């Protein structure tokens, strides 16, 4: 029920929204059916357009108009945006010079400088250049103020996700939304961009902006506009909202424009049609900015403009049909498009096998345009499986195409000619960020970054501690003048034990053989001191991790590699060693093809054994410090301890070897030497975070052995080229990846062909940021540098792409 019959006379866009059965007049009471009965008149008036002529200054107040040009219109906080400029002889905005905004100059009685956010729907990121000819608002805010050449979008890039994601600063899987389309099963319930369910607020997790501002006693616009609601009414409103007292005016304000989405999925991103949605939303950040220079808040109010993602040609044409995969294709439900979610059609179906399923869709046409997965085997990059309402299987759909159920869905439902959803590594998927205002910088291009790290700018902006969510807080402080947080380095919780040697040979019982008793005081003073930690300022380049966890460990030191070996865990939690340019690839000799062993610096309680392996007739083993880059046929012997071996299946050493023996070389001859730091994941609940102990599902057979999940490393050299990994004097480049540790390569359908027509394609797939790496294992990286701590954060957010430009 709503009784109706109320007014919203005096109440236009009001800011507390008011319970049922009392009508509304806030900016959702459309979207709602709740508005009062003379919410159109009164609120959405329209009369003589938006723009002041010639003829109207001056003009006598008719409160029919939509916008005035009379003298008292300034103080009433309602002129057209365009009143100065026809009436008072202004220029507009964009036709200004662009002057720096060294410090807020703000009207007496503005506690803190206004945050707008005016975010646009599929703004691809190269519609700033392409574009730009006919964008001159935003091509202003973009060179005058803080840019990114992109944005990165959240998985799936879709508009509720991405819109949350912002609001939010959290990964779908976290805050819910995980797509425009959802089920979930608990609630039992289907969510949808048509109907009422998506209103409820039980789908909604984490904390957004609004609430956040609310909760810390800054006052927030409603940031969500009916759709019938146009552009111009909605710049007038915050321009209203703007002129209300201080004790009631809001500090953070959202506008949102549905293009131009609209017409790029009707047209394709670069339809002819394209241009003037262009002008239109331009148009709109000139009313906006000329509407903001009229109250004297337009070198006060920070302003962001900014995407949720943006968009691709896809055409009816270019779809797969599962149809032509699966006999029992009435059994399963599609979330269909540009990603696949299937699941059983009914769970009273015990006859329901993800694994027939995923097997059918696997490598079965060689063009095939779509990768089934298991969620937990997706990218861990994506963070996109801890969620009841992502289902078990997944399909990551190739740019350009769609996926759908059978033939009949696709007629019975060519329309469209630009879609978007796809990975969020696709170049034409990555959206925009600008910043432009006193708290940003000016004339700044700042490198992409991702969409969840703007909240806790945004906060910042606003003076608000953020909720706790999933950016990295002083990442983006390279993109302020001032308002930086101070991010400081998490304390390090376990310190390593450093042993010496402890143990006899003959103490150890691992099952273990190596041809290894081969016979000088020079030689030996030297070895005692590689094991002592002579090389390590060469080996760890940037400290040693810190542990943020509690746990029993010892450092391992070498002449070739460290590590910090876990006696919890039975394996190294992180190897590192540092290859240069010039370093050479050796094999590993005949002789020490199975040689493991045994590490007199550890308690056979505590080392992994070789009887386990033999048992294991699904587990191998292989090492983490690689025997092939050894640096003398002596140092050789070290790679083979026990302390250096994990667990890994027959398939993964295939890719494993590869990586070791050809890729590190590779990357040391381009790079001009890389320290690479490796080791172990346990993710079994998918999550996205370390496992504890009693989280693991599986051991090598027989033992308390771990098996990982996954396998890391993280890649590092000088950004400057010209210098070597170990002697850089400046700033760092990255490149990391979390490969998963499967007993199959059937995500690559070019498995049976050599390892370099496949190995790379397939680690390219599973790059990774350090902060996910992080996350995964309780480490801290990159402690001990030259760097300034914020730009060692940001160095920490990257991810290598792989992306052409
Ligand atoms: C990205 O950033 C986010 C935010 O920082 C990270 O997510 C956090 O991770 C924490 C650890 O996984 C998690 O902490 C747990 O919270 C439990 C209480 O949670 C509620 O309250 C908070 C605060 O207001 C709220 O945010 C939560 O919201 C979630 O759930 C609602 C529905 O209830 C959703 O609407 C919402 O979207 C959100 O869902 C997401 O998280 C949940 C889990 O919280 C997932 O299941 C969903 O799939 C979805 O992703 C909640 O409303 C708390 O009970 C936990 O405590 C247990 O564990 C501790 C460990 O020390 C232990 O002391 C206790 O024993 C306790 O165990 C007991 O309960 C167990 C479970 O029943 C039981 O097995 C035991 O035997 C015990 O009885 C825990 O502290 C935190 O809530 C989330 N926050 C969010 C917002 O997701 C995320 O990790 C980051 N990602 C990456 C990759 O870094
Ligand atoms: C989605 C989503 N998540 N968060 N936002 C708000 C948002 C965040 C950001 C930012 F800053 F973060 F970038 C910028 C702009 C907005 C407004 C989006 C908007 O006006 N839209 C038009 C209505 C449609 S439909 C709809 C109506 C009501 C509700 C509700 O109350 O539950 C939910 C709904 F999905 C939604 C989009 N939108
Ligand atoms: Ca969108
Ligand atoms: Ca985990
Ligand atoms: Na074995
Ligand atoms: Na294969
Ligand atoms: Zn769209």
């Given at each position: 029920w709503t009784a109706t019959s109320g007014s919203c006379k005096g109440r236009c866009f009001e800011l507390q929204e008011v319970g049922p059965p009392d009508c509304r007049c806030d900016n959702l009471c459309k979207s709602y059916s709740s508005c009062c009965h003379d919410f159109d008149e009164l609120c959405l008036k329209?009369?003589?357009?938006?723009?002041?002529?010639?003829?109207?200054?001056?003009?006598?107040?008719?409160?029919?108009?939509?916008?005035?040009?009379?003298?008292?219109?300034?103080?009433?906080?309602?002129?057209?945006?365009?009143?100065?400029?026809?009436?008072?002889?202004?220029?507009?905005?964009?036709?200004?010079?662009?002057?720096?905004?060294?410090?807020?100059?703000?009207?007496?009685?503005?506690?803190?400088?206004?945050?707008?956010?005016?975010?646009?729907?599929?703004?691809?990121?190269?519609?700033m250049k392409k574009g730009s000819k006919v964008m001159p608002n935003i091509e202003k805010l973009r060179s005058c103020g803080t840019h990114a050449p992109y944005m990165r979008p959240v998985y799936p890039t879709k508009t509720f996700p991405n819109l949350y994601t912002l609001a939010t600063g959290l990964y779908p899987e976290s805050h819910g939304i995980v797509?425009?389309?959802?089920?979930?099963?608990?609630?039992?319930?289907?969510?949808?961009?048509?109907?009422?369910?998506?209103?409820?607020?039980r789908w909604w997790g984490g904390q957004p902006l609004w609430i956040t501002?609310?909760?810390?006693?800054?006052?927030?616009?409603?940031?969500?506009?009916?759709?019938?609601?146009?552009?111009?009414?909605?710049?007038?409103?915050?321009?209203?909202?703007?002129?209300?007292?201080?004790?009631?005016?809001?500090?953070?304000?959202?506008?949102?424009?549905?293009?131009?989405?609209?017409?790029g999925h009707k047209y394709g991103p670069f339809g002819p049609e394209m241009t003037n949605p262009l002008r239109e939303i331009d148009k709109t950040v000139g009313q906006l900015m000329d509407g903001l220079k009229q109250l004297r808040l337009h070198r006060c109010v920070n302003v962001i403009f900014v995407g949720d993602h943006g968009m691709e040609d896809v055409t009816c044409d270019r779809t797969e049909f599962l149809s032509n995969y699966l006999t029992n294709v009435d059994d399963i439900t599609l979330v269909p498009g540009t990603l696949g979610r299937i699941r059983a059609k009914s769970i009273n179906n015990s006859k329901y096998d993800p694994k027939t399923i995923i097997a059918a869709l696997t490598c079965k046409k060689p063009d095939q345009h779509f990768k089934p997965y298991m969620k937990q085997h997706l990218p861990k990059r994506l963070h996109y499986a801890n969620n009841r309402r992502i289902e078990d299987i997944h399909l990551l759909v190739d740019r350009r195409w769609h996926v759908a159920r059978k033939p009949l869905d696709v007629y019975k439902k060519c329309f469209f000619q630009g879609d978007h959803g796809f990975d969020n590594k696709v170049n034409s998927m990555q959206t925009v960020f600008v910043g432009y205002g006193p708290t940003f910088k000016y004339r700044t291009k700042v490198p992409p970054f991702e969409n969840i790290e703007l909240y806790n700018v945004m906060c910042d902006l606003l003076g608000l501690k953020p909720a706790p969510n999933n950016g990295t807080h002083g990442s983006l402080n390279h993109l302020l003048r001032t308002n930086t947080f101070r991010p400081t380095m998490p304390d390090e919780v376990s310190r390593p034990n450093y042993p010496g040697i402890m143990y006899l040979q003959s103490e150890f019982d691992l099952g273990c053989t190596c041809d290894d008793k081969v016979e000088n005081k020079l030689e030996?003073?030297?070895?005692?001191?590689?094991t002592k930690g002579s090389t390590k300022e060469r080996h760890l380049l940037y400290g040693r991790p810190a542990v943020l966890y509690r746990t029993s460990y010892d450092i391992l030191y070498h002449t070739d590699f460290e590590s910090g070996y876990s006696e919890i865990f039975l394996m190294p939690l992180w190897t590192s060693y540092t290859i240069s340019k010039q370093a050479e690839v050796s094999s590993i000799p005949e002789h020490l093809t199975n040689?493991?062993?045994?590490?007199?610096?550890?308690?056979?309680?505590?080392?992994?054994?070789?009887?386990?392996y033999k048992n294991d007739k699904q587990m191998s083993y292989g090492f983490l410090f690689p025997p092939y880059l050894s640096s003398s046929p002596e140092a050789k012997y070290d790679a083979f301890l026990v302390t250096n071996m994990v667990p890994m299946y027959p398939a993964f050493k295939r890719v494993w070897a590869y990586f070791q023996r050809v890729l590190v070389k590779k990357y040391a001859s381009e790079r001009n030497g890389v320290n690479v730091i490796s080791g172990p994941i346990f993710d079994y609940n998918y999550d996205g975070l370390r496992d504890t102990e009693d989280e693991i599902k599986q051991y090598v057979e027989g033992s308390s052995i771990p098996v990982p999940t996954h396998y890391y490393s993280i890649i590092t050299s000088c950004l400057d080229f010209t210098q070597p990994a170990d002697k850089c004097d400046g700033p760092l480049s990255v490149s990391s990846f979390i490969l998963p540790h499967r007993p199959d390569n059937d995500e690559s359908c070019n498995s049976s062909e050599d390892e370099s027509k496949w190995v790379e394609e397939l680690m390219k797939m599973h790059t990774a940021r350090v902060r996910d790496?992080?996350?995964?294992?309780?480490?801290?990286?990159?402690?001990?540098?030259?760097?300034?701590?914020?730009?060692?954060?940001?160095?920490?957010?990257?991810?290598?792409?792989?992306?052409?430009?």
């Open positions: 329209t009369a003589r357009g938006w723009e002041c002529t010639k003829d109207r200054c001056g003009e006598v107040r008719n409160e029919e108009n939509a916008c005035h040009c009379s003298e008292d219109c300034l103080s009433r906080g309602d002129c057209c945006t365009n009143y100065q400029v026809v009436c008072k002889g202004e220029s507009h905005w964009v036709d200004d010079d662009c002057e720096e905004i060294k410090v807020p100059e703000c009207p007496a009685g503005f506690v803190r400088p206004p945050l707008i956010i005016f975010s646009v729907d599929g703004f691809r990121a190269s519609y797509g425009n389309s959802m089920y979930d099963p608990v609630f039992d319930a289907s969510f949808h961009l048509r109907g009422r369910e998506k209103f409820n607020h501002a609310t909760k810390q006693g800054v006052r927030a616009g409603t940031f969500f506009w009916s759709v019938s609601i146009p552009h111009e009414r909605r710049i007038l409103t915050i321009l209203q909202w703007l002129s209300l007292p201080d004790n009631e005016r809001p500090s953070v304000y959202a506008f949102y424009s549905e293009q131009p989405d609209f017409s030996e003073l030297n070895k005692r001191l590689h040689c493991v062993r045994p590490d007199v610096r550890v308690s056979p309680g505590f080392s992994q054994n070789c009887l386990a790496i992080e996350h995964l294992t309780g480490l801290d990286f990159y402690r001990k540098t030259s760097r300034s701590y914020s730009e060692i954060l940001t160095l920490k957010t990257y991810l290598h792409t792989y992306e052409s430009e």
